[PDB]
Design a binder for this molecule. Sequence first.
Ligand SMILES: C=C(C)[C@]12C[C@@H](C)[C@@]34O[C@](Cc5ccccc5)(O[C@@H]1[C@@H]3C=C(COC(=O)Cc1ccc(O)c(OC)c1)C[C@]1(O)C(=O)C(C)=C[C@@H]41)O2
Ligand SMILES: [Ca+2]
Ligand SMILES: [Ca+2]
Lengths: 79, 129, 556, 95
Amino acid sequence: SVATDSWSIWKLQKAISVLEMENGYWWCRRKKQRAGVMLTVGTRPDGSPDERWCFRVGEMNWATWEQTLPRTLCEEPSG
Amino acid sequence: NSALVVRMYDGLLQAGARLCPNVQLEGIPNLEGLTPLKLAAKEGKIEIFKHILQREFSAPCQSLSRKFTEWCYGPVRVSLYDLASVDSWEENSVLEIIAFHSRSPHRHRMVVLEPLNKLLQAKWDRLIP
Amino acid sequence: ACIQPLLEIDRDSGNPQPLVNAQCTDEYYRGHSALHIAIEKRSLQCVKLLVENGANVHAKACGHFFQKNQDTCFYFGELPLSLAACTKQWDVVNYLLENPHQPASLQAQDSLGNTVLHALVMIADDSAENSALVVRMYDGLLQAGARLCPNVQLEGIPNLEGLTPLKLAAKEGKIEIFKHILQREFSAPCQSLSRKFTEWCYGPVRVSLYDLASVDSWEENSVLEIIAFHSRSPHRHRMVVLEPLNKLLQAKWDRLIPRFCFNFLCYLVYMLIFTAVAYHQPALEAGNSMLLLGHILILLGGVYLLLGQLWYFWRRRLFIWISFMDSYSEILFLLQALLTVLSQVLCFLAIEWYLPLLVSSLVMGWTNLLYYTRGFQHTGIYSVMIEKVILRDLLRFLLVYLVFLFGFAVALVSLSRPPYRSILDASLELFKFTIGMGELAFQEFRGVVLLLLLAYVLLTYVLLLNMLIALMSETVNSVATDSWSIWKLQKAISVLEMENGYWWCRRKKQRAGVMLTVGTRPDGSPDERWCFRVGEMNWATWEQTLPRTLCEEPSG
Amino acid sequence: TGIYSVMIEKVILRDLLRFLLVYLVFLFGFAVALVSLSRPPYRSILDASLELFKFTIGMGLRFRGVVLLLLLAYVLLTYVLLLNMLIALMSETVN
Ligand SMILES: C=C(C)[C@]12C[C@@H](C)[C@@]34O[C@](Cc5ccccc5)(O[C@@H]1[C@@H]3C=C(COC(=O)Cc1ccc(O)c(OC)c1)C[C@]1(O)C(=O)C(C)=C[C@@H]41)O2
Ligand SMILES: [Ca+2]
Ligand SMILES: [Ca+2]
């Protein structure tokens, strides 16, 4: 057996719990709220602006210097 | 197999942006009402499921990407992950599919993926009380 | 194209406070300057231009974003030079060091008192790509520093925490560079910068010298003292085994075997007196004065142990607070001393509760004797695994087992036998069965009792297998080298405490290294160093080239 | 059968002797603490430690509370040593 599996199987157990908690026992309709923040990622193929509900994940990569820089939304670190 | 699938799949999305811009190909459901991503989730196709969630495209046709970078300073950066088909808020979400609908032995492997694992950690922290 | 015109306008507008040096103001981005931006954008041509128009090459970006403790924040030192260095832009670094108008200074330090070396120690992590970068830049700056400022020893500059780059690497658990610094050799002219030399070399054999400056216990806040007590990294034990330190710590131990055995005898004796005192206790009712003699010693020794442990925690443990995981052995001695002194007070004050406290201190005192097993390797590893198993692993098994025990205990007594249940007597009677002590007693629904019992015995067995499997899985997954290091660090703790001294102080013990004139041509008088000599034997040396040596022969 | 006898010798010497050293210290220390509690016709620390050993085998008011609590910790620690000894064997065989 893969050593990582037991840990992932647990994270899935939590995933089951979290989703059912959001449903609710008898007061079911309360835990209905979107996650993440909605931002304008860019323009679509269809002229309208491409807006999306996004989740923020911080990253640090030390080998990126050689590769090209990605197009970014903001000009400087914010928040 | 996986290397072909991601390479072919992406090449078709780019072509679709040029040949049929108004059409969102990943929005077309099948008779079972599953989009390609939800299908990958239900059928336990990890490698492409992973690739779709964290997709990056440069210069033209930038829009068809599920991962973006808000800002970047030196090594640090903040990445944005599209949650459209992902968020539990929506009906028949990817998470709900994996949690309950999928019948692959490796569902647990699927939960631990960059956008989903962080998201589930966030929701858990909110639900401790 | 607008920057050069734009700045000329600003100057021609009579701005007293030039625009180029304008800096950000919010607590988040405080201090950032246009030069910082040009460096981060990796544009030397822009860097040159900003400097050529009076850009302050020593402006500090001190805001929250540029701080070491924050999450999703980049700490690179605060200065432009540290930025360029920390983002691997030698083309920028060289210009900041070599431009004629305004050379950047290698001595400059930030709000934390950190130089470019300090920062490079901070940004480094154990990933391979990062580590290779840091050493390359770190060394490349030392060579430059030898050229730009010979008289200054850059690694000698401490920060506000009084830590040099090496000590910083030690406290922050930066192995790859810490290891590199200790085993550093230079082949270029600046031979003085290297900390490793070869005294002499004969055939396959040779002796290598390791600089002990920041390492040796003689100086305050030594690397060894820092790692043992100040560092708070999980892989600190990994650092102790590095080539120069392991040999060095073994040397210090070998000289300290007597003191260890002596202290073992003392504690053993103290326990024997403690043993006799508790055995001869008669509860309600020269010789009787001698029994008081015993109690006196116990009180005297218990405070001394309590004082000693307090001194250990008093000396360096004030900012640690809960160091239970780090020093499991140290805690028990304090509790034993604490419990022993408290027991004597009650004994003097005729309190009937002292006896439990007295015996409790006795039993614990003898068990604590396992402390001294660290002298030998085999027993030392066994004692380490005891500590590990008891500490982290037993809590979870027991917590689960009680739930099974309690739940099954209530159900079986409630089922068997107006009927008087004792949760204690119940759980006790069921625990002793598994423990093998006693046997279950029939009340005289027997059928249900048997089925329930079957579930218990098997399920209890399942828990054992999980504990074995979970315990077993840790050993296979754990690196074979890892378990041994934890012991060598325990020894490192002992040697350092012995060098501290008792209450009748035995300080300023003899230095462990030998001082030699490693460098012939420093800028000035010859440079002397306290080095540790380590013998080496290499049978594949014939193909490789011979190293430059201090001596010509093993003699001298 | 001959290799089986080789492993017995190895296990007895390197692993069991080490357990025995730790186990005896625990046995002595806990036996004396239990005797000091008993306190009169005094059972010898030997006679006591014997009584505590046969207790483990299952053969068979400060006094009541401490006596029981101390014993419960004893049974656990003795089992810990066995589990540790078993773990020590597994790590030795792989190497
Ligand atoms: C608070 C702690 C850390 C602690 C105190 C007591 C209860 C302890 O059991 C533990 C856990 C325990 C409690 C109750 C039942 C089983 C286990 O571990 C130690 C503590 C652990 C033991 C077992 O011996 C050891 O700790 C090994 C050891 C001793 C000294 C060392 O310097 C050492 O470092 C390597 C290791 C001795 C006891 O203190 C003891 O003699 C009594 C009566 C119980 C043991 O609790
Ligand atoms: Ca049995
Ligand atoms: Ca067994």
